[PDB]
Amino acid sequence: MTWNFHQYYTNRNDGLMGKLVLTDEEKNNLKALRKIIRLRTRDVFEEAKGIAKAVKKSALTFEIIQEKVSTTQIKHLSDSEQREVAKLIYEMDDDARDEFLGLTPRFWTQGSFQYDTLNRPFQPGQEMDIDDGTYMPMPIFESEPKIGHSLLILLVDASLKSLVAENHGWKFEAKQTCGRIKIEAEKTHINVPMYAIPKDEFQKKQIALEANRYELDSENVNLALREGDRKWINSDPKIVEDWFNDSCIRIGKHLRKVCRFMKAWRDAQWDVGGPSSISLMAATVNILDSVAHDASDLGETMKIIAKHLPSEFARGVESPDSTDEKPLFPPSYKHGPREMDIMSKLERLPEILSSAESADSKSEALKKINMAFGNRVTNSELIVLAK
Numbered sequence: 054m055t056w057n058f059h060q061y062y063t064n065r066n067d068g069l070m071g072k073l074v075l076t077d078e079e080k081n082n083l084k085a086l087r088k089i090i091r092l093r094t095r096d097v098f099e100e101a102k103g104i105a106k107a108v109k110k111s112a113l114t115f116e117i118i119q120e121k122v123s124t125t126q127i128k129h130l131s132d133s134e135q136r137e138v139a140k141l142i143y144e145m146d147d148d149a150r151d152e153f154l155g156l157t158p159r160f161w162t163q164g165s166f167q168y169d170t171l172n173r174p175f176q177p178g179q180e181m182d183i184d185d186g187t188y189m190p191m192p193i194f195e196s197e198p199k200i201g202h203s204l205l206i207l208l209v210d211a212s213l214k215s216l217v218a219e220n221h222g223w224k225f226e227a228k229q230t231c232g233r234i235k236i237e238a239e240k241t242h243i244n245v246p247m248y249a250i251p252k253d254e255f256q257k258k259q260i261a262l263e264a265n266r267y268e269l270d271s272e273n274v275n276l277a278l279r280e281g282d283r284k285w286i287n288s289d290p291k292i293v294e295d296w297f298n299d300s301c302i303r304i305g306k307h308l309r310k311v312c313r314f315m316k317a318w319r320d321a322q323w324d325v326g327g328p329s330s331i332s333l334m335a336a337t338v339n340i341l342d343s344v345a346h347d348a349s350d351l352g353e354t355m356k357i358i359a360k361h362l363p364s365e366f367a368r369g370v371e372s373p374d375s376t377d378e379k380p381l382f383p384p385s386y387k388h389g390p391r392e393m394d395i396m397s398k399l400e401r402l403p404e405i406l407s408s409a410e411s412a413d414s415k416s417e418a419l420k421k422i423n424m425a426f427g428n429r430v431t432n433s434e435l436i437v438l439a440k
């Protein structure tokens with residue numbers, strides 16, 4: 054007997070899609086969390102700009118600057134951090150100070166929350182994440198921007214830390230590409246990567262936008278590296294977003310669904326680790342662009358995807374952004390223990406899907422396919438006998 058799994062995957066209630074898509078409680082909870090961080094980040098920058106504006110008018114001692122800082126939200130930084138902030142503001146150039154007084158922090162969400170691939174967590178320790186980037190409109194720079202890299206990082210840290218001090222169960226964590234607020238009890242964390250963009254082009258596009266009811270020069274979108282050798286690196290997140298969105302248009306609405314399923318499979322096989330979300334997306338896109346498939350039957354499509362995935366990761370997965378210094382996934386001749394473990398799981402997937410298809414009953418078919426996605430869908434009646 055052959056079983057069809059289309060309803061198993063796509064049913065918005067009892068199906069896998071029904072288990073992966075965020076509830077209104079979780080979705081609005083993430084939006085509220087993002088709103089709080091955006092408000093605080095802007096308020097913190099205004100407080101810092103207020104101190105700098107006082108400096109501009111009447112010359113203040115470094116002593117007075119440090120006491121002003123201690124009263125603001127910057128106080129939630131360490132004593133050494135508070136002092137450097139007061140030092141940077143005090144030792145700031147006259148021309149550099151004018152640039153800062155006009156600094157306007159902007160925000161734009163990237164990642165799965167933006168292109169709607171965000172799944173509900175499965176195993177303990179797994180969390181939902183919002184990738185809300187902060188943009189700093191400044192003049193184009195080559196090496197070091199007008200407004201210091203150190204100052205921008207500290208002010209963002211102060212904003213995040215000030216929110217942690219106001220919430221039990223919240224914790225701050227610094228990664229290489231962003232600052233992070235972790236909410237363990239809610240299985241949630243928000244990442245805040247900082248970018249530098251051309252102020253002139255930003256104002257231009259903003260003026261045209263408001264009058265019409267717009268991506269800037271990609272080479273001038275600089276990501277701030279916290280612990281890296283380089284303070285800045287040209288990493289435009291818009292490249293990945295446009296790539297995936299264009300792929301969804303080119304391939305169809307079933308692309309986001311199958312991408313969710315592979316990520317759910319990833320969450321089921323590893324409590325932590327496994328292939329990156331972007332690597333799964335890129336590989337899946339390559340398959341649906343090269344191999345014929347039927348969107349009306351995502352059960353067959355997933356089988357087709359699982360069949361070709363191992364060869365995709367073996368070849369190595371190229372990044373949608375050619376600017377990337379590394380591929381999303383290494384080729385076979387560069388595989389270590391980590392990649393071999395991933396290859397082992399990938400080769401196992403198609404066997405699991407086939408086994409579930411040849412099960413003796415709906416009940417048996419459910420638990421077999423649940424080997425790939427874990428126990429989420431409990432309704433075996435979603436599985437129908439193949440015509």
Ligand SMILES: CN1c2c([nH]c(N)nc2=O)NC[C@@H]1CNc1ccc(C(=O)N[C@@H](CCC(=O)N[C@@H](CCC(=O)O)C(=O)O)C(=O)O)cc1
Nearest residue numbers: 158159160161162188250267268269270271274289290291
């Ligand atoms: C990203 N971007 C980008 C560009 N170009 C290139 N090459 N790379 C880039 O990364 N161009 C545009 C943008 C960079 N420039 C801008 C970034 C942010 C803003 C701005 O006014 N943001 C608003 C919020 C936008 C939002 O919530 N938006 C919502 C969308 C609507 C909603 O969710 O309700 C959201 O963030 O989810 C704000 O700061 O309050 C204005 C311009």
Ligand SMILES: Nc1nc2c(ncn2[C@@H]2O[C@H](COP(=O)(O)OP(=O)(O)OP(=O)(O)O)[C@@H](O)[C@H]2O)c(=O)[nH]1
Nearest residue numbers: 163164165170171172182184290293330331374377
């Ligand atoms: N160019 C480039 N961008 C990346 C890479 N990895 C992550 N990013 C960016 O970082 C953002 C967040 O990526 P992830 O959180 O790992 O992927 P995701 O789609 O959010 O997956 P989940 O977080 O598991 O839902 C993405 O929107 C990408 O733009 C990479 O290797 N190259």
Ligand SMILES: Nc1ncnc2c1ncn2[C@@H]1O[C@H](COP(=O)(O)OP(=O)(O)OP(=O)(O)O)[C@@H](O)[C@H]1O
Nearest residue numbers: 164182183184228230231244246276288290329377
């Ligand atoms: N090439 C890149 N360019 C810009 N940002 C990136 C890039 N790769 C990852 N990021 C950022 O890092 C986050 C992805 O996290 P990563 O894959 O580094 O593991 P992690 O979440 O740091 O692991 P852990 O949760 O154990 O700290 C994304 O939210 C993204 O904003």
Ligand SMILES: [Mg+2]
Nearest residue numbers: 164165182184
């Ligand atoms: Mg993410």
